[PDB]
Short mmCIF file of N, CA and C in Angstrom, two decimals:
data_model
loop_
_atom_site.label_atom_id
_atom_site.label_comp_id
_atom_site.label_asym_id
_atom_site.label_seq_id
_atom_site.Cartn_x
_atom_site.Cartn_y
_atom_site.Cartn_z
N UNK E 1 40.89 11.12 237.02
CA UNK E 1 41.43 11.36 238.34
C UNK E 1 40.93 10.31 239.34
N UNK E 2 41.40 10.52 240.61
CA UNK E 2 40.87 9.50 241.97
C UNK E 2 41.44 10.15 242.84
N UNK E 3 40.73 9.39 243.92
CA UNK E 3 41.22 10.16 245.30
C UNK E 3 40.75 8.67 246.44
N UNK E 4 41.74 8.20 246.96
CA UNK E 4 42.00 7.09 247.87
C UNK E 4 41.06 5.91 247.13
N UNK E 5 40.86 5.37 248.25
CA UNK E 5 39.92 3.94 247.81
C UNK E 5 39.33 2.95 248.99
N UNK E 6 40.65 2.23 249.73
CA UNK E 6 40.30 1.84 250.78
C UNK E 6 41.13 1.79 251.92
N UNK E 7 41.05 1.38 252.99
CA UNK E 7 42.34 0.89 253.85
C UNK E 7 43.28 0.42 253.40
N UNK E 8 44.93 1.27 252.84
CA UNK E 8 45.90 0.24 252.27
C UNK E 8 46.67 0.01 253.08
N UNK E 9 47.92 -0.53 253.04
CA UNK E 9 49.00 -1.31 253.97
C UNK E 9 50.06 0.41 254.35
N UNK E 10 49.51 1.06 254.12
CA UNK E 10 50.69 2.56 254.32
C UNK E 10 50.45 3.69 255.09
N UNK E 11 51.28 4.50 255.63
CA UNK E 11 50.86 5.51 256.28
C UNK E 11 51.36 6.89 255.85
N UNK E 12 52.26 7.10 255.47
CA UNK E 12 52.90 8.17 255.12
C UNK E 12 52.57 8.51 253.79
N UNK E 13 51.58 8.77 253.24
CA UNK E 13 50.79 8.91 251.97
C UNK E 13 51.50 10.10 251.25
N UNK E 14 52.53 9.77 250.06
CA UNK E 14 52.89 11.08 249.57
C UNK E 14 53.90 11.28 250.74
N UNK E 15 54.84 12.04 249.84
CA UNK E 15 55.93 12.77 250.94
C UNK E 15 55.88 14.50 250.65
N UNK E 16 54.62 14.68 251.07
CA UNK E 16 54.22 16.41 251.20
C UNK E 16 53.89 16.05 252.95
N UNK E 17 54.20 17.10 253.59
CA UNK E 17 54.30 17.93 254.73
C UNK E 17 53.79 18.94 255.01
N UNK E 18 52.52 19.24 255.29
CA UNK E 18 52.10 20.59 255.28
C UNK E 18 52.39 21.41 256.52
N UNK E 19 52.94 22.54 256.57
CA UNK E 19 53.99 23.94 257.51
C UNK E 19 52.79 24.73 257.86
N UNK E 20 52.51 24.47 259.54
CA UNK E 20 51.47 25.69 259.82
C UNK E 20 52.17 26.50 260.43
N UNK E 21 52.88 27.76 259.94
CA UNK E 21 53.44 28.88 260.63
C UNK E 21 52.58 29.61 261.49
N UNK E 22 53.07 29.78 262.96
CA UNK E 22 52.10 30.43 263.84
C UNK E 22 52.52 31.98 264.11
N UNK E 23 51.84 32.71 263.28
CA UNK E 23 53.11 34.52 263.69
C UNK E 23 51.85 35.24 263.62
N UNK E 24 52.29 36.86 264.06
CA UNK E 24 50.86 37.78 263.99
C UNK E 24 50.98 38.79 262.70
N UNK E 25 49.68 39.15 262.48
CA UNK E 25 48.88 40.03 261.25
C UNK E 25 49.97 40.81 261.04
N UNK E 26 50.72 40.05 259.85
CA UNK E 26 51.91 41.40 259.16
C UNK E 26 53.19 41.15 259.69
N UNK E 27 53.75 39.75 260.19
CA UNK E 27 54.95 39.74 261.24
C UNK E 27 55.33 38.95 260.06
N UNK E 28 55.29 38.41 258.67
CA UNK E 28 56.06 37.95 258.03
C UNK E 28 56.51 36.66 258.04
N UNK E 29 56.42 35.70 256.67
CA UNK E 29 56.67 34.15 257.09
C UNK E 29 58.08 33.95 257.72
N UNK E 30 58.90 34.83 256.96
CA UNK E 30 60.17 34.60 257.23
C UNK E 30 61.18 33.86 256.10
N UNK E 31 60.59 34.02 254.96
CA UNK E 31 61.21 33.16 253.71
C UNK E 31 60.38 34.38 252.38
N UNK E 32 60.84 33.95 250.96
CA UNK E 32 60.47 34.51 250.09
C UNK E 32 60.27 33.41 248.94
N UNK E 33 59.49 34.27 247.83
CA UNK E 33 59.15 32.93 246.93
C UNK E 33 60.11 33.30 245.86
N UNK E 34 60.82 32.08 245.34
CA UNK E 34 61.67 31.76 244.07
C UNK E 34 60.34 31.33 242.65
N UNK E 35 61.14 31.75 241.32
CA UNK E 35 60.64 31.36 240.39
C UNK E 35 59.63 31.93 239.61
N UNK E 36 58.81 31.36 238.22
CA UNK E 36 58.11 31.97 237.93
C UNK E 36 57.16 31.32 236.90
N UNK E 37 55.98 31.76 236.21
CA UNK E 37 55.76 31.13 234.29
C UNK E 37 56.52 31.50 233.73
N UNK E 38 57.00 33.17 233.44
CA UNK E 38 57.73 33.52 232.70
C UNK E 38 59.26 33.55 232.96
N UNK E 39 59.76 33.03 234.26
CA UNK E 39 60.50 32.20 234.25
C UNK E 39 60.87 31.09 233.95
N UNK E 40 62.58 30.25 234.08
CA UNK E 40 62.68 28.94 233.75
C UNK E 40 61.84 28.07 234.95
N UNK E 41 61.82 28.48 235.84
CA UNK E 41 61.03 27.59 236.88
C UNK E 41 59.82 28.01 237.12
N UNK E 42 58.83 27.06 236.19
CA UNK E 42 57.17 27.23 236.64
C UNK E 42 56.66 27.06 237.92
N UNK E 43 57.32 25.92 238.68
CA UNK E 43 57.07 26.29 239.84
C UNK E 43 57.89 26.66 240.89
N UNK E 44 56.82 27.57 241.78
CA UNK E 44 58.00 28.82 242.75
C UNK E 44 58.36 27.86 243.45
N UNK E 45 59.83 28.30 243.51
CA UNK E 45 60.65 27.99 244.97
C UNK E 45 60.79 29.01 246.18
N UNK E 46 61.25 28.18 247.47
CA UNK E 46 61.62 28.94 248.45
C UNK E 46 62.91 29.57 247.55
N UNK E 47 63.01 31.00 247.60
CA UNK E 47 64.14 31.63 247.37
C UNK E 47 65.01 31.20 248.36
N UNK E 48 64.87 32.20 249.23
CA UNK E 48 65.58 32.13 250.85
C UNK E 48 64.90 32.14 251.88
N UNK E 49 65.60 31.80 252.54
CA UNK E 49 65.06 31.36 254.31
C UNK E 49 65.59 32.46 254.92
N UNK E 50 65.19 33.38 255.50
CA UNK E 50 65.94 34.64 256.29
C UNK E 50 66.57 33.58 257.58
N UNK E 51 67.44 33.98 258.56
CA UNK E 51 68.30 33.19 259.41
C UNK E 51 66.89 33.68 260.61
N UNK E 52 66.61 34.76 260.77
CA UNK E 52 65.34 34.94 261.86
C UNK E 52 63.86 35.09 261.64
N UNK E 53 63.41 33.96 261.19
CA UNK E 53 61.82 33.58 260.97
C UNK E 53 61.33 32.64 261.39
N UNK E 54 59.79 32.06 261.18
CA UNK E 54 59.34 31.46 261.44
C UNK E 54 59.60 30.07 260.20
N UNK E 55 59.74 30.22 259.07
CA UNK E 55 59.68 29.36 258.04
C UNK E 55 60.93 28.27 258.51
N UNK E 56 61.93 29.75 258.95
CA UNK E 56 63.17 28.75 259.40
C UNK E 56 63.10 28.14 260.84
N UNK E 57 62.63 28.93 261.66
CA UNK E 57 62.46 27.88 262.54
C UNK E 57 61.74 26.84 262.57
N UNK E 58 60.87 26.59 261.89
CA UNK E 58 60.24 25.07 261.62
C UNK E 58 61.11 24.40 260.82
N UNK E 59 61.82 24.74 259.48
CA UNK E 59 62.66 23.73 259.38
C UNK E 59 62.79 22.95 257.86
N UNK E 60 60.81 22.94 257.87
CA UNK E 60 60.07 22.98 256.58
C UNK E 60 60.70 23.20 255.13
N UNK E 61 60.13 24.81 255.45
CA UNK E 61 60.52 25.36 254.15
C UNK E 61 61.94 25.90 254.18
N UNK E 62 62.73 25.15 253.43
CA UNK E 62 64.02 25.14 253.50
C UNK E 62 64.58 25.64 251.85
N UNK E 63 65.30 26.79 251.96
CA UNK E 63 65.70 27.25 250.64
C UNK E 63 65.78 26.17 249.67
N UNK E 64 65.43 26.29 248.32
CA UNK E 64 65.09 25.08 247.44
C UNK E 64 64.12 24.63 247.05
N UNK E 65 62.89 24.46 248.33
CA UNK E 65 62.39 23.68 248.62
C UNK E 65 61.42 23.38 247.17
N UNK E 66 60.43 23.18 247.25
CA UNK E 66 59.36 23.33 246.48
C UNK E 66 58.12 23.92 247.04
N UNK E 67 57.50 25.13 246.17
CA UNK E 67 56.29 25.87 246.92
C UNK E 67 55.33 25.53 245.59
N UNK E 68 53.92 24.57 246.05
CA UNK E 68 53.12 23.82 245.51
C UNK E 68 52.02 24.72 245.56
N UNK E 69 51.57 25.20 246.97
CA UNK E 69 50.65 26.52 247.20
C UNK E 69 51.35 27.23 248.14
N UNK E 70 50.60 28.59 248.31
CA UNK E 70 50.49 29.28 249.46
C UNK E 70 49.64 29.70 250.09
N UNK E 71 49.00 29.46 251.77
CA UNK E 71 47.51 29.89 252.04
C UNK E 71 46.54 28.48 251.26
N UNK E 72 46.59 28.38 250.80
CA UNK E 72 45.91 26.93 250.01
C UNK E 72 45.92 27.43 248.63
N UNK E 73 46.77 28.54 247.93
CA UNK E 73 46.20 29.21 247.05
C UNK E 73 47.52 28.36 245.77
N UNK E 74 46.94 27.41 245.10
CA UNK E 74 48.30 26.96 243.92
C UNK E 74 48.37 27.64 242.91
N UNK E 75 49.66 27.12 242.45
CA UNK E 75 50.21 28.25 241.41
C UNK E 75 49.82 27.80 239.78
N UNK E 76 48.68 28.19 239.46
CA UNK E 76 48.27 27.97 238.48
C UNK E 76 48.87 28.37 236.94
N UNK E 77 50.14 29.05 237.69
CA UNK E 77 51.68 29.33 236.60
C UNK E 77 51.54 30.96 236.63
N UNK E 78 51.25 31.23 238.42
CA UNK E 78 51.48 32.45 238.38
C UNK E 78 52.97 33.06 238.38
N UNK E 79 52.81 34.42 238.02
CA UNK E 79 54.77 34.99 237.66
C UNK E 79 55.30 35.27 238.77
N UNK E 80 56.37 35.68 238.66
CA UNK E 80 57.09 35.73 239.85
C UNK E 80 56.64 36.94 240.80
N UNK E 81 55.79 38.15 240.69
CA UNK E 81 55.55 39.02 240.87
C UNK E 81 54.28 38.67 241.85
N UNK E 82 53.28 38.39 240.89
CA UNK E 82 52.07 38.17 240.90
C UNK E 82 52.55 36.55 242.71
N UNK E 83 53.12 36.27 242.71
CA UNK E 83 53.69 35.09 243.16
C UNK E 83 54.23 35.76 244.36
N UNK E 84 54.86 36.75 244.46
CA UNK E 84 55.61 37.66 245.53
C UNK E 84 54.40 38.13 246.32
N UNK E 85 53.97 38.63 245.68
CA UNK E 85 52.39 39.79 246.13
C UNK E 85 51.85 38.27 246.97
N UNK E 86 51.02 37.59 245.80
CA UNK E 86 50.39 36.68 246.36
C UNK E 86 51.14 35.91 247.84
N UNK E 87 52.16 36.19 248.08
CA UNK E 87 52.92 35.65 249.09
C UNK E 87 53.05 37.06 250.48
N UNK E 88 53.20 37.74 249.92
CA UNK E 88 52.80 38.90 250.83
C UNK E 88 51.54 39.69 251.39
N UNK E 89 50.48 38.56 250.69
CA UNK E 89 49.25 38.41 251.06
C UNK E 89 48.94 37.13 252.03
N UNK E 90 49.76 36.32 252.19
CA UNK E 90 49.51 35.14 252.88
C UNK E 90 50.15 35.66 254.47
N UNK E 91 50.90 36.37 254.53
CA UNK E 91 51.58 37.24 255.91
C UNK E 91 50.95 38.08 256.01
N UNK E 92 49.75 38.31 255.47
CA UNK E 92 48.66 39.08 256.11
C UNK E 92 48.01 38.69 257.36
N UNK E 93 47.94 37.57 257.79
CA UNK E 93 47.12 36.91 258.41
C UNK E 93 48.11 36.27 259.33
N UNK E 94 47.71 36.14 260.39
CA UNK E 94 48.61 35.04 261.33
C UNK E 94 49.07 33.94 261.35
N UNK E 95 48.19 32.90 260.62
CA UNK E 95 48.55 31.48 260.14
C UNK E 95 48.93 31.63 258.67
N UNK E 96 49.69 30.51 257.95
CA UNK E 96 49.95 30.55 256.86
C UNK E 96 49.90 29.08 256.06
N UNK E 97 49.71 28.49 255.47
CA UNK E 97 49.93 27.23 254.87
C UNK E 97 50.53 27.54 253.28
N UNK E 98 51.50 26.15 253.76
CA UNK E 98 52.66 25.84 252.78
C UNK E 98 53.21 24.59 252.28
N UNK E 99 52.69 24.11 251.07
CA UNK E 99 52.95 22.81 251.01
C UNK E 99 53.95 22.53 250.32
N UNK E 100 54.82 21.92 250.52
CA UNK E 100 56.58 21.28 249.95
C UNK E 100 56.41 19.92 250.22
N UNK E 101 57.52 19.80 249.14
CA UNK E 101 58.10 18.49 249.53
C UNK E 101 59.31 18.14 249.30
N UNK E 102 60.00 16.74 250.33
CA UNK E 102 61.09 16.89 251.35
C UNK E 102 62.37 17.10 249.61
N UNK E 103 63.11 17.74 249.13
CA UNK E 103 64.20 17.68 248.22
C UNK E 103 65.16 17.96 248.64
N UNK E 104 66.44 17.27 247.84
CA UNK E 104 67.80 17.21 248.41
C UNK E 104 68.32 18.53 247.65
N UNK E 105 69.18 19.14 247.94
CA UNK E 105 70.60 20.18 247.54
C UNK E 105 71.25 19.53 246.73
N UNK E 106 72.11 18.64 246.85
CA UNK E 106 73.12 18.04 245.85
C UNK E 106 72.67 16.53 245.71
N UNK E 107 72.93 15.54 244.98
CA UNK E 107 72.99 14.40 244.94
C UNK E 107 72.29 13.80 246.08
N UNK E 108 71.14 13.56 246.11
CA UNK E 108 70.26 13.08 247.36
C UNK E 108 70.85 12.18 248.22
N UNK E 109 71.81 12.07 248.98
CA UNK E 109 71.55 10.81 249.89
C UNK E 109 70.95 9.90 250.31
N UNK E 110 71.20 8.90 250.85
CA UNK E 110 70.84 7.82 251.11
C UNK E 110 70.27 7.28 252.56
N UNK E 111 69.20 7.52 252.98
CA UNK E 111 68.65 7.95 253.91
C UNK E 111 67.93 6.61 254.12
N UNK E 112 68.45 5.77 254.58
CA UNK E 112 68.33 4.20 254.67
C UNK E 112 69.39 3.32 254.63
N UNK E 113 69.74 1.87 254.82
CA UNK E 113 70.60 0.91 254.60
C UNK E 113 69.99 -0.34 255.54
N UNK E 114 70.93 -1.70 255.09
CA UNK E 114 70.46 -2.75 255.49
C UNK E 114 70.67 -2.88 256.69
N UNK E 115 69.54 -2.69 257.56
CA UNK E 115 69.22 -2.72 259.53
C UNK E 115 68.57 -3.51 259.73
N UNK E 116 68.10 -3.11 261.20
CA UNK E 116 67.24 -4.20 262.09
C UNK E 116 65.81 -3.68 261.36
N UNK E 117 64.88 -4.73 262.18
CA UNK E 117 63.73 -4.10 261.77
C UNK E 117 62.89 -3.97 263.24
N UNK E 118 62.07 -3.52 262.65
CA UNK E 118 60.94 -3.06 264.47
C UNK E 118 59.75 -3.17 264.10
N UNK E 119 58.86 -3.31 265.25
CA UNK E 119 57.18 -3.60 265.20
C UNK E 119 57.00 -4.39 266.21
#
């Protein structure tokens, strides 16, 4: 393994985003977890985004998405159950952490082309 090294030429290290949901003790992220081990997908997804939450109003965790941890807690190939709970333990608390990263729905687009440049 490793972990950094020195000053490199980059800033945006990794395209993970970490989601601090701000809600109170028991008010709910506002999303649910997809997937499972003993499912085809080892790792959980956002199921759904309810239309009135916090998950969705940030923007973040967007149905699909990818759920890496929850609370800081990763999924060491927990089931979908064990994964639910564990997620209904993280809306225990007022803050929540959620780490994803950014994935497309259909055929990713192209989120760039030949422009100006700046600096």
């Amino acid at each position: 393994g490793s972990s950094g090294s020195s000053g490199a030429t980059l800033k945006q290290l990794d395209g993970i985003h970490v989601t601090i949901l701000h809600k109170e003790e028991g008010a709910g992220l506002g999303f649910s977890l997809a997937g499972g081990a003993d499912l085809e997908n080892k790792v959980i997804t956002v199921h759904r985004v309810f239309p009135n939450g916090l998950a969705s109003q940030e923007g973040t965790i967007q149905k699909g998405n990818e759920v890496l941890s929850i609370n800081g807690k990763s999924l060491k190939g927990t089931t979908h159950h064990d994964a639910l709970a564990i997620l209904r333990q993280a809306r225990e608390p007022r803050q929540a952490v959620i780490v994803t990263r950014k994935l497309t729905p259909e055929a990713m687009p192209d989120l760039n082309s030949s422009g100006p440049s700046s600096g």
